[PDB]
Amino acid sequence: IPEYVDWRQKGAVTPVKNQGSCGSCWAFSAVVTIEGIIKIRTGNLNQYSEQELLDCDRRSYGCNGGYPWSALQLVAQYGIHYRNTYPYEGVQRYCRSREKGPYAAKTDGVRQVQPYNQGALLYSIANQPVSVVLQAAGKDFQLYRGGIFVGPCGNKVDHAVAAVGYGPNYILIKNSWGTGWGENGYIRIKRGTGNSYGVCGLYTSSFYPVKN
Numbered sequence: 001i002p003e004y005v006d007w008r009q010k011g012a013v014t015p016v017k018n019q020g021s022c023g024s025c026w027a028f029s030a031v032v033t034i035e036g037i038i039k040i041r042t043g044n045l046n047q048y049s050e051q052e053l054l055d056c057d058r059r060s061y062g063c064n065g066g067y068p069w070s071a072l073q074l075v076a077q078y079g080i081h082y083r084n085t086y087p088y089e090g091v092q093r094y095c096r097s098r099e100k101g102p103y104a105a106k107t108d109g110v111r112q113v114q115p116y117n118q119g120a121l122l123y124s125i126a127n128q129p130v131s132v133v134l135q136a137a138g139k140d141f142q143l144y145r146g147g148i149f150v151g152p153c154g155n156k157v158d159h160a161v162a163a164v165g166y167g168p169n170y171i172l173i174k175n176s177w178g179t180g181w182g183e184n185g186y187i188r189i190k191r192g193t194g195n196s197y198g199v200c201g202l203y204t205s206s207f208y209p210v211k212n
């Protein structure tokens with residue numbers, strides 16, 4: 001697989017969003033992967049609804065947190081609407097999937113990347129954007145402004161983001177904290193250190209949707 005991968009260059013990544021004060025990272029992470037796979041499969045880059053997942057995935061806790069796997073399972077079973085049809089409000093409301101008409105896209109399943117394995121994650125990233133988790137609680141992560149992030153951070157994963165690329169010494173991540181955070185909304189996290197958990201526990205729980 002290539003030495004450098006960047007899904008933004010291939011037109012598979014939509015603009016950076018801001019989740020606000022709502023703990024909806026899981027929904028954002030899941031949506032990036034859906035937007036990516038639909039582009040790779042159909043050739044069309046569309047934006048999908050984080051709000052729908054927030055309101056409809058009852059296995060998750062709305063603005064209190066949730067699971068990317070669960071959100072991806074919901075899109076596989078039912079489907080998802082376009083972001084303009086069901087826009088982000090930043091607050092959990094009732095599931096409005098029904099009133100908004102037929103779904104825009106549907107996936108066929110979800111697979112998990114072999115955890116604690118850098119190679120497995122890089123292979124998945126080379127194929128499509130992947131939902132990954134990491135420890136974001138530390139002030140070093142929160143105040144990241146640029147460069148290759150090496151930490152400091154432990155492996156107490158608490159934030160769901162998405163891997164959209166990589167390079168020789170980094171994994172490119174799309175965060176959901178607005179364009180003013182990090183590298184225009186992105187973070188390049190150090191890879192190849194020999195830490196099985198990954199920098200900030202990056203290799204703990206990674207999922208991607210299956211289409212076709």
Ligand SMILES: *[C@@H](C(=O)NCCc1ccccn1)C(=O)C(=O)N[C@@H](Cc1ccccc1)C(=O)N(C)C
Nearest residue numbers: 022023024025026065066067133157158159160205
């Ligand atoms: C993610 C959330 O949105 N966190 C960001 C909060 C923040 C900080 C600064 C500025 C703006 N927003 C959310 O908590 C969440 O859903 N966390 C999950 C991640 C996870 C971890 C392991 C497996 C699956 C999902 C979480 O910690 N739990 C579900 C426990």
